[PDB]
Amino acid sequence: MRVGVLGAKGKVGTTMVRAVAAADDLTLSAELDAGDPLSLLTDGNTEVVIDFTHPDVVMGNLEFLIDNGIHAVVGTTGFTAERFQQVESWLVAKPNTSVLIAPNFAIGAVLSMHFAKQAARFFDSAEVIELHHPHKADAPSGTAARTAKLIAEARKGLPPNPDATSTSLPGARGADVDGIPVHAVRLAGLVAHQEVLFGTEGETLTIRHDSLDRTSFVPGVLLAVRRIAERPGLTVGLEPLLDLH
Amino acid sequence: MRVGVLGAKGKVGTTMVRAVAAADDLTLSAELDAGDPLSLLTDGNTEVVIDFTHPDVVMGNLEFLIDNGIHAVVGTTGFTAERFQQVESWLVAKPNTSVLIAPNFAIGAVLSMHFAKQAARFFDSAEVIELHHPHKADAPSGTAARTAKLIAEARKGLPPNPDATSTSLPGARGADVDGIPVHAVRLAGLVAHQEVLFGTEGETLTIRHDSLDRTSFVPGVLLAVRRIAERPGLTVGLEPLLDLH
Amino acid sequence: MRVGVLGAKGKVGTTMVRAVAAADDLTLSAELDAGDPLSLLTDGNTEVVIDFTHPDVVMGNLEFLIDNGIHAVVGTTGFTAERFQQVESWLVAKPNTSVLIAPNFAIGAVLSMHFAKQAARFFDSAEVIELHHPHKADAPSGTAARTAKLIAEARKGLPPNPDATSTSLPGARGADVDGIPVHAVRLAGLVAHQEVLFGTEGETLTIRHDSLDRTSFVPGVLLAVRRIAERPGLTVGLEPLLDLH
Amino acid sequence: MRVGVLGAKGKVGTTMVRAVAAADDLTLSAELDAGDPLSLLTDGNTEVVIDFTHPDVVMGNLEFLIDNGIHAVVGTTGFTAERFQQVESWLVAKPNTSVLIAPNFAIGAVLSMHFAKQAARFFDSAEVIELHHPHKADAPSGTAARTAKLIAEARKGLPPNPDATSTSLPGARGADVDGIPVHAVRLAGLVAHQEVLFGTEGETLTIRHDSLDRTSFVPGVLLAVRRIAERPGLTVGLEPLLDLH
Numbered sequence: 001m002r003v004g005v006l007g008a009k010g011k012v013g014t015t016m017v018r019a020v021a022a023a024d025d026l027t028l029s030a031e032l033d034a035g036d037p038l039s040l041l042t043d044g045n046t047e048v049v050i051d052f053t054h055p056d057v058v059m060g061n062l063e064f065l066i067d068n069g070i071h072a073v074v075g076t077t078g079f080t081a082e083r084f085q086q087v088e089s090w091l092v093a094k095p096n097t098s099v100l101i102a103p104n105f106a107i108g109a110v111l112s113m114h115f116a117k118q119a120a121r122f123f124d125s126a127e128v129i130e131l132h133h134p135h136k137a138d139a140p141s142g143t144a145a146r147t148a149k150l151i152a153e154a155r156k157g158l159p160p161n162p163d164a165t166s167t168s169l170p171g172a173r174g175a176d177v178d179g180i181p182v183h184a185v186r187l188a189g190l191v192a193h194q195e196v197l198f199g200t201e202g203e204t205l206t207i208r209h210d211s212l213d214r215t216s217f218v219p220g221v222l223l224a225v226r227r228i229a230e231r232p233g234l235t236v237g238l239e240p241l242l243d244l245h
Numbered sequence: 246m247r248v249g250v251l252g253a254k255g256k257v258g259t260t261m262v263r264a265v266a267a268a269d270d271l272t273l274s275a276e277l278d279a280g281d282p283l284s285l286l287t288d289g290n291t292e293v294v295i296d297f298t299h300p301d302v303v304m305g306n307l308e309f310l311i312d313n314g315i316h317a318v319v320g321t322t323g324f325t326a327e328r329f330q331q332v333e334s335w336l337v338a339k340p341n342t343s344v345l346i347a348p349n350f351a352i353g354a355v356l357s358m359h360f361a362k363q364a365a366r367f368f369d370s371a372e373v374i375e376l377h378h379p380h381k382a383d384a385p386s387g388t389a390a391r392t393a394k395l396i397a398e399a400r401k402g403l404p405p406n407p408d409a410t411s412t413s414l415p416g417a418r419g420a421d422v423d424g425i426p427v428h429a430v431r432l433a434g435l436v437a438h439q440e441v442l443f444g445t446e447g448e449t450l451t452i453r454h455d456s457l458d459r460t461s462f463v464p465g466v467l468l469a470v471r472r473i474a475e476r477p478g479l480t481v482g483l484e485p486l487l488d489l490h
Numbered sequence: 491m492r493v494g495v496l497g498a499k500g501k502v503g504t505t506m507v508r509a510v511a512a513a514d515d516l517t518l519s520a521e522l523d524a525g526d527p528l529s530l531l532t533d534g535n536t537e538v539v540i541d542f543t544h545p546d547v548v549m550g551n552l553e554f555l556i557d558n559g560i561h562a563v564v565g566t567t568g569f570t571a572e573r574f575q576q577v578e579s580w581l582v583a584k585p586n587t588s589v590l591i592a593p594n595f596a597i598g599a600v601l602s603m604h605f606a607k608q609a610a611r612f613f614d615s616a617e618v619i620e621l622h623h624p625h626k627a628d629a630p631s632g633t634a635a636r637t638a639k640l641i642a643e644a645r646k647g648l649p650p651n652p653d654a655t656s657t658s659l660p661g662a663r664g665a666d667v668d669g670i671p672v673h674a675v676r677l678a679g680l681v682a683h684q685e686v687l688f689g690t691e692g693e694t695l696t697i698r699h700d701s702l703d704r705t706s707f708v709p710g711v712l713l714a715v716r717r718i719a720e721r722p723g724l725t726v727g728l729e730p731l732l733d734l735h
Numbered sequence: 736m737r738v739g740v741l742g743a744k745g746k747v748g749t750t751m752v753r754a755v756a757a758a759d760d761l762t763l764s765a766e767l768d769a770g771d772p773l774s775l776l777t778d779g780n781t782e783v784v785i786d787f788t789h790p791d792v793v794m795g796n797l798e799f800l801i802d803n804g805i806h807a808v809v810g811t812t813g814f815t816a817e818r819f820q821q822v823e824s825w826l827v828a829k830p831n832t833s834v835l836i837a838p839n840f841a842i843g844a845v846l847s848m849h850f851a852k853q854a855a856r857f858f859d860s861a862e863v864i865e866l867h868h869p870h871k872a873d874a875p876s877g878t879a880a881r882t883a884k885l886i887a888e889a890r891k892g893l894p895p896n897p898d899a900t901s902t903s904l905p906g907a908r909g910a911d912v913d914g915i916p917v918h919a920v921r922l923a924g925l926v927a928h929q930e931v932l933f934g935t936e937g938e939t940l941t942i943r944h945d946s947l948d949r950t951s952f953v954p955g956v957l958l959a960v961r962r963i964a965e966r967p968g969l970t971v972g973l974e975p976l977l978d979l980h
């Protein structure tokens with residue numbers, strides 16, 4: 001399988017390149033970076049590409065890939081409904097091509113979102129604390145925003161979190177994601193971490209995921225790369241790829 | 246509903262007494278303590294009793310209760326297979342009577358065991374850290390031992406945790422519960438806490454439950470008390486009464 | 491020693507009342523609550539009063555106390571420079587009277603602020619996460635704000651925390667306290683908790699304090715109550731009371 | 736300054752080699768590995784060597800280095816009193832040569848031991864939890880054992896930790912290091928982590944250090960390498976080179 005990496009120079013990209021180069025069943029056909037022509041992909045006859053670039057260019061590359069029938073495993077965050085809809089209104093005019101987008105390829109993270117959904121109804125309060133390296137451009141993380149959305153969707157009928165906050169400094173209570181407060185920590189020495197807190201009478205439940213190394217995203221990426229053709233079109237998250245694993 | 250409390254003087258017992266006394270749909274019929282005759286129960290026409298005593302007496306009281314057809318919601322730990330088996334038969338001679346035993350009545354704890362079971366297969370390493378007040382007689386906690394057992398049972402076909410420990414101080418690697426290391430911390434200022442750690446390539450997953458107050462066990466207890474008659478015989482755990490599997 | 495409690499009905503107040511009532515060397519002379527005349531204090535010939543009321547009334551009571559020469563151990567938060575200055579411009583016109591104000595009476599908390607000050611210079615990043623019960627009116631906590639101030643004051647010559655945040659949801663990065671981000675979590679089941687995070691190349695340092703029970707403030711309060719007369723005027727924090735202990 | 740690395744192939748060694756190679760003021764004179772002759776050091780005219788090998792060989796290399804007057808910054812754990820004593824004399828016959836041994840070069844770790852010493856007296860209970868990668872040969876970690884020793888030494892006059900443990904599974908309460916329980920966790924995905932827990936009435940204090948990356952040891956190592964000649968003889972720890980006492 002010929003595989004090319006979009007953003008091969010990035011923190012995550014360089015890792016994926018190393019991973020694909022080590023995969024005995026995969027062939028690194030392309031190593032695109034900022035500026036390099038998207039034609040380099042069609043040159044190496046790439047069939048699947050791993051995208052770990054920037055939200056300002058994803059939509060751009062996604063058009064090219066979907067055109068030449070090249071499959072795509074995208075990790076680049078900042079995917080909005082309109083964008084998904086964009087990607088949607090494209091695959092239709094060129095099926096047989098598969099595209100997978102996931103806010104997090106770490107298995108522990110996917111499991112965290114899974115458990116968060118299940119525990120939400122049993123508690124009065126729910127908050128999300130996300131912590132990342134000081135090089136992250138977006139706050140809060142895509143995963144945090146998605147986790148908050150999942151929680152808020154599971155507590156549909158229930159009342160909102162209890163909060164007697166009368167006086168407060170601007171921003172002290174974090175960002176509001178569908179009624180669920182989300183706090184973003186940018187600290188040196190960190191990579192990718194998340195904490196989901198549920199609280200009730202005399203007890204709390206904490207589901208924490210820690211990505212100590214960027215290699216933690218490899219397994220999920222390669223898994224999606226190999227079984228990419230299994231599902232045509234868009235997928236979103238890698239939950240379907242292992243809900244039975 | 247007439248409800249009596251066994252061990253009404255204990256740390257947990259005094260809380261249950263207060264809870265039952267506040268329950269508008271429940272009547273505190275008995276407040277037994279160490280020494281007090283089990284006949285006080287039959288005196289107040291008790292139909293259900295909450296047991297939070299000591300493992301050295303549970304079996305004793307359980308016989309009396311099961312005889313007079315009184316239902317029992319037991320929280321007292323130290324329940325072994327033989328003990329469970331014993332109680333099993335005890336009721337077979339007196340059906341129509343219900344008995345529920347649970348290692349933990351905190352919902353977060355029950356959920357922790359639920360999630361632990363589901364995540365076990367996805368990781369290479371698994372360990373349990375349990376932390377309690379310095380007044381606990383047993384180490385590790387009943388919940389910890391049960392959680393470790395659940396994890397070990399979910400990883401049936403998989404190899405054991407990787408460990409290159411060559412030299413070590415006695416007891417440094419905690420207790421072995423079916424191949425899963427369990428560490429017991431006894432610290433002042435704590436109540437009931439547990440941490441389940443799963444580890445793999447570049448990432449870890451932590452599921453932590455915190456019982457900051459003993460009132461956290463009330464909801465689970467009262468829930469079992471009210472729906473006690475729903476399931477005749479012996480029931481181990483709170484899961485059956487919960488939506489989860 | 492005759493001791494009266496201001497706000498004897500509050501979550502913390504009721505605890506202090508119980509504590510003073512148990513102190514064999516202390517006499518509970520007053521149990522004021524909302525509405526009750528401040529004259530009840532002068533009635534029982536109170537010499538020291540524990541204040542755990544509300545920031546909207548502290549200044550009021552503080553005037554009365556300082557007038558009748560009654561000593562005061564205040565725990566009520568929301569103490570600003572002007573207010574301190576107010577309390578300052580009063581004791582002068584009536585010395586021989588002592589007043590102690592502390593943002594936190596938990597020893598672990600005081601120690602946390604102590605360590606935070608010492609570690610600040612050794613790290614690139616520093617952030618504060620504070621977590622409290624959903625009944626707290628102010629965000630962030632007084633202790634959190636004070637800890638952030640201490641940290642920012644210790645890193646005087648050093649550059650600010652590195653942060654590449656380009657796009658962000660309003661409030662995601664918490665409140666800014668002298669360049670130190672502070673996050674406030676309001677969750678059910680919690681009491682008083684704080685986490686100080688320091689980060690640098692490949693490592694982080696976390697100093698966490700947990701007030702699982704309101705009784706944790708008793709030792710510090712009573713300590714200040716007994717040795718109150720030792721220092722005339724205002725003090726601020728109970729660091730001087732044990733920097734040598 | 737000519738610097739050679741002992742164990743240049745190890746997890747930590749390869750990092751130090753990369754670090755020294757990047758240091759504009761340092762020259763990588765040697766890259767010894769298992770088997771390679773210690774004479775390679777005398778070949779490149781090495782003046783200082785970084786040792787990150789194995790406790791079974793340290794004593795061996797230390798003799799050679801101290802003989803040829805080569806300075807040594809040793810990170811290899813497993814240093815016992817007898818071993819320290821031995822090295823002591825080894826240098827007495829060859830002064831003018833400096834040797835520094837430290838159980839941890841991460842600044843956060845050194846600070847942790849510093850704070851642990853200061854907080855010990857203020858609490859009833861104290862326990863240490865250490866967590867490392869599943870490739871560590873010794874349990875508990877050298878740092879954990881040292882931290883436990885420091886704590887036990889600071890609580891000289893005070894009574895031991897309160898523990899009502901009557902029944903227990905073998906090893907559940909961790910290893911005993913001078914009366915301080917130490918728990919060792921070996922999990923995949925981890926690197927080097929430690930947690931010091933202090934407990935008292937209604938509150939706990941946690942001092943946690945996290946080495947997410949092995950690069951975290953570089954700063955401390957290079958600092959000791961450059962200022963090595965400053966202190967003739969043997970030096971244990973990094974504290975001397977630091978502002979702290």
Ligand SMILES: NC(=O)C1=CN([C@@H]2O[C@H](COP(=O)(O)OP(=O)(O)OC[C@H]3O[C@@H](n4cnc5c(N)ncnc54)[C@H](OP(=O)(O)O)[C@@H]3O)[C@@H](O)[C@H]2O)C=CC1
Pocket residue numbers: 006007008009010011012013032033034035052053054055057074075076077078102103104105106217
């Ligand atoms: N879903 C997941 O599991 C994960 C997602 N991510 C997300 O992936 C993205 C990047 O990760 P990270 O490595 O930290 O990011 P980087 O800051 O390292 O940026 C990655 C690479 O993309 C580049 N690049 C930019 N534009 C193009 C382009 N048009 N064509 C090809 N290359 C381009 C960069 O070049 P230059 O910088 O010179 O412009 C850089 O080399 C973020 O959105 C991040 O949140 C990260 C980890 C995991």
Ligand SMILES: NC(=O)C1=CN([C@@H]2O[C@H](COP(=O)(O)OP(=O)(O)OC[C@H]3O[C@@H](n4cnc5c(N)ncnc54)[C@H](OP(=O)(O)O)[C@@H]3O)[C@@H](O)[C@H]2O)C=CC1
Pocket residue numbers: 251252253254255256257258277278279280297298299300302319320321322323347348349350351462
């Ligand atoms: N399943 C769960 O969710 C939970 C289970 N537990 C378990 O429940 C038990 C209680 O712990 P905790 O309440 O903190 O401990 P305590 O010892 O504080 O409470 C125990 C009470 O039982 C007593 N008692 C002893 N024997 C009898 C008897 N035969 N008849 C009635 N009273 C008796 C005691 O008296 P005296 O002390 O004078 O002997 C004491 O009042 C433990 O086994 C604990 O592990 C605890 C919390 C939760």
Ligand SMILES: NC(=O)C1=CN([C@@H]2O[C@H](COP(=O)(O)OP(=O)(O)OC[C@H]3O[C@@H](n4cnc5c(N)ncnc54)[C@H](OP(=O)(O)O)[C@@H]3O)[C@@H](O)[C@H]2O)C=CC1
Pocket residue numbers: 496497498499500501502503522523524525542543544545547564565566567568592593594595596707
């Ligand atoms: N420094 C420290 O270690 C700690 C400080 N605090 C601080 O102390 C304050 C309160 O603690 P908490 O118990 O949670 O608060 P509560 O919400 O329980 O309020 C406390 C009591 O003060 C009352 N009170 C109000 N005004 C007066 C008045 N003028 N005269 C006397 N009584 C009055 C209340 O009555 P009503 O509600 O009916 O008006 C209530 O009974 C807060 O500022 C909190 O942040 C808390 C813990 C520790």
Ligand SMILES: NC(=O)C1=CN([C@@H]2O[C@H](COP(=O)(O)OP(=O)(O)OC[C@H]3O[C@@H](n4cnc5c(N)ncnc54)[C@H](OP(=O)(O)O)[C@@H]3O)[C@@H](O)[C@H]2O)C=CC1
Pocket residue numbers: 741742743744745746747748767768769770787788789790792809810811812813837838839840841952
């Ligand atoms: N003080 C501190 O801050 C730190 C201390 N340490 C300690 O340092 C040591 C290193 O751990 P780590 O690097 O992860 O382990 P590794 O085993 O990955 O690194 C050890 C290296 O030393 C080797 N080597 C063995 N004997 C010799 C020898 N006689 N001459 C030179 N090379 C030799 C190895 O070869 P081979 O494997 O083939 O035998 C291996 O390359 C441990 O004792 C660890 O506890 C670790 C981190 C920090």
Ligand SMILES: O=C(O)c1cccc(C(=O)O)n1
Pocket residue numbers: 077103104132136140141142143144191192
């Ligand atoms: O959901 C996210 O935005 C996310 C998840 C993991 C890592 C990163 C990152 O390194 O930027 N971002």
Ligand SMILES: O=C(O)c1cccc(C(=O)O)n1
Pocket residue numbers: 322348349377381382385386387388389436437
């Ligand atoms: O599973 C247990 O043994 C357990 C759970 C909660 C509290 C206690 C306790 O207070 O002893 N013990």
Ligand SMILES: O=C(O)c1cccc(C(=O)O)n1
Pocket residue numbers: 567593594622626630631632633634681682
């Ligand atoms: O610094 C604070 O504001 C503080 C500290 C401890 C407890 C509380 C509280 O219970 O409101 N508030």
Ligand SMILES: O=C(O)c1cccc(C(=O)O)n1
Pocket residue numbers: 812838839867871872875876877878879926927
């Ligand atoms: O004190 C120790 O033994 C220690 C400290 C950091 C890392 C390691 C290690 O990687 O073995 N060991």
